[PDB]
UniProtKB/TrEMBL annotation, chains A, B, C, D:
The lineage of its organism: Eukaryota, Metazoa, Chordata, Craniata, Vertebrata. This is Transthyretin. GO terms for molecular function: hormone activity; thyroid hormone binding. Homotetramer. One of its GO terms (biological process) is purine nucleobase metabolic process. Thyroid hormone-binding protein. Probably transports thyroxine from the bloodstream to the brain. GO terms for cellular component: extracellular region. It comes from Sparus aurata. Keywords: Hormone, Secreted, Signal, Sulfation, Thyroid hormone, Transport. It comes from the Eukaryota. It is found in: Secreted. Belongs to the transthyretin family. Residues 1-116 form the Transthyretin/hydroxyisourate hydrolase domain.
Length: 116, 116, 116, 116
């Protein structure tokens, strides 16, 4: 029932990516951003209770994943400064969002699963 | 504690890929393949109790996903005939294997998550 | 001898992604961004002469790809608003960058090829 | 006018994947396979003139990429035994193919670019 979920995997080690820091922001009508939550994945590459339903109204959201610190801690030199995922939420109605992210030092894949 | 799991996602639809048929085969002594299980993904893109521990000793395995029929039914003409994932497994001591698979008509991404 | 190249592919059609608009920006001292180039991919999914040697000093760069319009114009309703790639660029020795991007309605893969 | 090209990239180092051995087979009328070419990528992750026009009729093809040895040659331990890409070719006609392959030790992405 958590409206926004993440699932982060490490494609080098074949494990989830633990202790990846992230920030969730909401777009403002002027095109700026307001931070609504921060979090850190657990050893399963997930975050519980990131945000509540009330904090998640329809609109455009940005999730910034601090992948550079993840790789630096892993002993690898990464390419990207950050990984940002930007999307409109609820352009139709309700439902829950899971942002899947697969990380390599010089690449990432991101997909969404949108369900109800 | 399912020794072999799958998680299939649809990158066009933004949902798990349900009703994907697959076959699990085990490499034999003379280098052939024997089929040891079949299944179809559920609506969460998974197959529960695909094989038992007793059916899964150390060895080389092949999991064949029938992605072409998945796309043909969806109405998209796909590039690949099948998606095959081949790997050496050593499950003894509860090492669990999850094969993740992200599908598009002309591309797939596949990753493994191996427990410790 | 283009310091910065892109290669965008469409994973639904199995063709390069033509007509994708993009913006190249450089991080400024005050932490802001200054746009240094814009373009639209050709039918090979590339943009030649995106920027010159002289406009590519060391520093942080952002390339924003307008993937939403790409999909909506192909008649698909996508997940992401945009796809952003942010990286610190170096090459002291004529080192060049290729940003590869593989697009599906609800997913993208981005990788970098850095020469040397 | 190579009807079949490949492009293999390394997602750990950010370079093309050099010296990857591969084997190309064609599906026979009976459901078997016949080998029609072998090669090794150059440092650009390509193989020039893998096969001729005359060797590439419409039909089902398999490319077996020896990713396991790629990774051990890089000094890493990989998950997959091989990466097989099986696809249907240009019954109508004409059409040329590029198989793109992005490699990480525990993951790969396979896509195709099919151009007239």
């Amino acid at each position: 029932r958590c409206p926004l979920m993440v699932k982060i995997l490490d494609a080098v080690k074949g494990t989830p990516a633990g202790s990846v820091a992230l920030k969730v922001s909401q777009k403002t009508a002027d095109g700026g951003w307001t931070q609504i939550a921060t979090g850190v994945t657990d050893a399963t590459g997930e975050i519980h209770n990131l945000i509540t339903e009330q904090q998640f109204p329809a609109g455009v959201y940005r999730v910034e994943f601090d992948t550079k610190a993840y790789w630096t801690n892993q002993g690898s030199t990464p390419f990207h400064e950050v990984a940002e995922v930007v999307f409109d939420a609820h352009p139709e109605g309700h439902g829950h969002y899971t942002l899947a992210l697969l990380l390599s030092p010089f690449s990432y894949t991101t997909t969404a699963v949108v369900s109800s």
